[PDB]
Symmetry: C3
Subunit: 446 residues, 3 copies
């Protein structure tokens, strides 16, 4: 049969999408028959482990990749030409993030998710529970991101980021708060991207003395790219257990879709127009080429981002598929795509935009025109400061609301539905990188 020929050449494509629907059929049979209580907590961790093992070993290789592949990328061309590459790049990440957040106002206002329904029953969901939050100030977190760039110690920025807390050591009368930083747990991806680019330029200023050093990091880049190919074969096995592990936790067979299902359909549709109708239209307007043939070549990482629910996870998996399947250049694909891992959270700019209108569609708040331009520019700024940590964008939602002085009286409605909507967020998040990667292929042709 001739149909057997195309299936052998599309083996990873077929196995990935058949597994993401397998766990939904697997997990609903677990959640329906018996439920979460039938397994027991001492066995539930053993069930979710073959999915949780996937997210582990696929994360350990981004450290010898991102600090390594940006060297050989940003030391080939000249630093005068890198400004002709970088300035057109950061302009593109700013427009795509801002245009996605502009859809958030334009879709939530025309649908009004704060409608007369069970969603307005937030008093049963609030309970004063999530009020006990750190909720750092908007001046401090914006100051914290500039301090997270240019890290303190180079080894310490491989596993331990920087943040800030508050204390009250102020027995003087009128007890005030005092900021203090303590370097909490978490990998600093952004702190090492800005190091490797600056370190990559310094090898270009050197003459033939750096020729030994650049071929070292070129070879050490290539050995990791061999090792990411073997994890790619394991990836259809793990995604079957990512979805079928998370679905055991909550239930939406008539409970979660009943209360705030209008909001869920509001934000999934925000991911529907953007990145499936807008980004192909932008890509065709600059290339005049078929975007879906480009999009079909990248479907294993995009389905993996739905499973792993982390943009920083699926970073090496996309770097294999873009340079192999689609016709891009070797060196420039390994530069614009890793810097795009933590700079264009436009899904978060679409998630935190709608969710900040959603609580203001209810509870009778105006937002006529002055708050609209502030809620538009804040979400496209905090998206840069967001990490690739799963469910990390919920923490940056509270700093938008205080700056636009909306009530935070129940943030717990937007919370506890982010096991589903954030998986759609990462797919839209990582898609604009490779669409921007192929957009620079036409730019070098002229």
């Amino acid at each position: 049969d001739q149909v057997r020929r195309c299936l052998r050449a599309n083996l990873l494509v077929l196995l990935t999408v058949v597994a993401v629907v397998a766990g939904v059929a697997l997990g609903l049979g677990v959640s329906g028959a018996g439920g979460a209580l039938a397994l027991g907590p001492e066995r539930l961790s053993a069930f979710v482990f073959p999915g949780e093992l996937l997210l582990r070993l696929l994360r350990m290789i981004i450290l010898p990749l991102v600090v390594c592949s940006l060297i050989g990328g940003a030391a080939s061309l000249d630093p005068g030409a890198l400004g002709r590459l970088g300035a057109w790049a950061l302009l593109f990440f700013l427009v795509t993030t801002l245009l996605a957040s502009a859809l958030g106002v334009g879709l939530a206002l025309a649908l009004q998710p704060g409608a007369a329904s069970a969603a307005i029953n937030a008093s049963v969901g609030a309970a004063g529970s999530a009020e006990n939050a750190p909720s750092k100030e908007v001046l401090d977190s914006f100051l914290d991101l500039a301090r997270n760039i240019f890290p303190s110690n180079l080894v310490s920025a491989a596993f331990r980021s920087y943040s800030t807390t508050y204390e009250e050591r102020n027995i003087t009368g009128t007890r005030v708060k005092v900021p203090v930083g303590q370097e909490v747990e978490g990998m600093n991806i952004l702190g090492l991207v800005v190091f490797a680019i600056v370190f990559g330029v310094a090898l270009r200023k050197l003459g033939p003395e750096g020729e030994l050093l650049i071929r070292f990091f070129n070879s050490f880049n290539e050995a990791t790219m061999v090792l990411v190919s073997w994890i790619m074969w394991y990836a259809p096995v793990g995604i079957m257990f990512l979805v079928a592990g998370k679905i055991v936790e909550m239930e939406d067979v008539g409970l979660l879709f009943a209360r705030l299902g209008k909001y869920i359909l509001c934000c999934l549709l925000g991911h529907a127009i953007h990145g499936l109708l807008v980004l192909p239209l932008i890509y065709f307007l600059f290339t005049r080429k078929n975007p879906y043939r480009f999009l079909w070549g990248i479907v294993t990482p995009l389905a993996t981002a739905f499973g792993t629910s982390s943009s920083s996870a699926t970073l090496p998996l996309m770097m294999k598929c873009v340079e192999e399947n689609n016709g891009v250049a070797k060196h420039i694909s390994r530069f614009i795509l890793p810097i795009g891992a933590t700079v264009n959270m436009d899904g978060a700019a679409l998630f935190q935009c709608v969710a900040a209108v959603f609580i203001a569609q209810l509870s009778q708040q105006s937002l006529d025109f002055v708050k609209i331009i502030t809620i538009l520019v804040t979400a496209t700024a905090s998206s840069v400061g967001a990490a690739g940590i799963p469910a990390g964008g919920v923490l940056t939602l509270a700093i938008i609301l205080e700056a636009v002085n909306l009530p935070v009286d129940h943030i717990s409605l937007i919370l506890a539905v982010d096991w589903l909507v954030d998986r759609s967020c990462t797919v839209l998040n990582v898609e604009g990188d490779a669409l921007g990667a192929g957009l620079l292929q036409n730019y070098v042709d002229r």
Copy 2:
């Protein structure tokens, strides 16, 4: 004199064994005349320091060795031949560990250490003291070892391993336990062995691009091997203070040997037959060569393992003595011996076997035939999960006993005698590596 000629060529052999008996004569004069109280705690740390300095600097070089020497080892030969090297290897570590644990049942049953003596006075030793223990479940620790393999972050696995604890954040009615992991202190040796082997194969799949990279790690391996030679000369000084520091702590001039000295003679004899009568018989059955001439060439690391009481400590010291003194190959000795550091704790499979019969010889427990095959297969499994941390195998003793549902009413009798029996454990532990290393020299001759 002709006797002066052999002593100059056997200088390290003579100085090492004269120092391990020097500290016993030194420490008993300290423990006898004056005792531990005559020195004071502010001076006792200053006394144990020249031994404690030895265990420190000899441990800092295993990180630029194990992740480095396994690269140049497992990138020379073909990956098809590595399966012909690896499968025969892991079969040998399984048999030697299981045969050692089979001696534990066969020697404790024929001697019955739970005899009518002062050893049955465990009520004075129990006191409900060591009941306050974490004692993680057998399903979780077996799950934890698979998660400790394939580490989370590559830099973070150089000093910080992974484990798990328990919390009770369960105010819902019927308060249950919940697992949580927090990455406690401790070097992950096993997490980096599995990384370097996979990374070593990927250089072999590369062509001449990896030729620069393999010669880098070949040279960086050799510079450490120079530096381990200088610490080897310091090693007879330190072992004199390892033994004469630990002996100041407890006393066995008629007190510890009186109560449970039958148990101590039971487990030291278990280390006597295995690895001095069995392993020479296995080595002669496959080589038909003199095992003791091979064994005399490795006596400085084996006496160092008695002093340091850590298998992961004496790993670089054996790698010098095997490739220099005995006639083994250069590349294959630096592969099978580091992977054997944390895979064949057969002394622990002999220690945790007898100690789990010892508490069941007392307190009237049966173990007729069904528990015997479970207590045999559990100890040979948890020996793989054991670390090279001194006195680390005591924590893995409790997970055997709950799985074989024996009482843990006094584990503190097996505790606080492990300053002596565990030093015999590490000597038997590290011996089977080099005997297995020389066993593969005959395998390449055919």
Copy 3:
């Protein structure tokens, strides 16, 4: 104009000294008009940030420099000649530190800072506040420094040093203290200097196998030296905010200079004679060359040490200025100057000498002749154990006083004036390195 020609060639010299006086004029206008309370604590951290950003990114490059530049330095020459370089070196650091501490007795006794003034009103300053201190014993901290050399783990010594605390887990009757170490936060500079020197010698014992490895670390050294040049241009901006941030904290417009201003003039004059009259006289006695033409070539790092107030901070900044401006050799300047970062705290030997006479000039204490030779040799020993941490030498002041059994009834007078006197300490501290660096240039001419 011909005066425009010299200003273009002295751009860094002119911009650095015009900024250290700019912040004094800036900060006094802030402290005078409005004061510290006019800004608010939520804005004060935003004001001090462009200075605090300078101290951050200029510290992240000392890890890929000190462990890297000492390799290519101490592997070129022979190890027989390194003893002819090292022994003359460590003799020079011992004399310069001891001669500086000899000035501390000779200047405090001839001035008597414990005079009838407001400085003797220490009862208002003591309050029993700083009595709650750890204050580890003199035998333990001297033992701790030898354990901090030869670190435990190589990766862990890049951000996490070693220290010791005390516990009282001693329910046996007569509750005593027990030492325990826990690896507190802080970069171990000294632990990696002793590693790279020993590792550098081992490459020299290797033949042409180390030729690949030495050219690797030679190139990786040079790429950092490019990157330190770009931070040097940012350095006149940051020092303007270092001084104008610290001056907002305290006030000395008639308050701090009134109470103990005799002591401040006593210790600043101790930094005046030493290192501006003594060290030029020593340098002229061995070179017969102009020391101030050598001293004018290094004025950007010396003014930076006044701003950063850390010897370990300004280590790469001096390594650029010495090898470029002044006529020293390339390889030997990158060896003696990094080892001099944490070995010759003679300012601390001048600070901790005077401050230990200052509390004994008051409160009627003798120190006739026997305590004088002990207070001289203790301060030159603890200066080696001092770190490059700002305000780190105050902790090592208490261990001098107990060994010379002077009262520690108010150490808080020497505390809280170290925002000013310690900035003079680091300038004198880092100056003797480069004066010692140029002193070895004449030694290689013969």
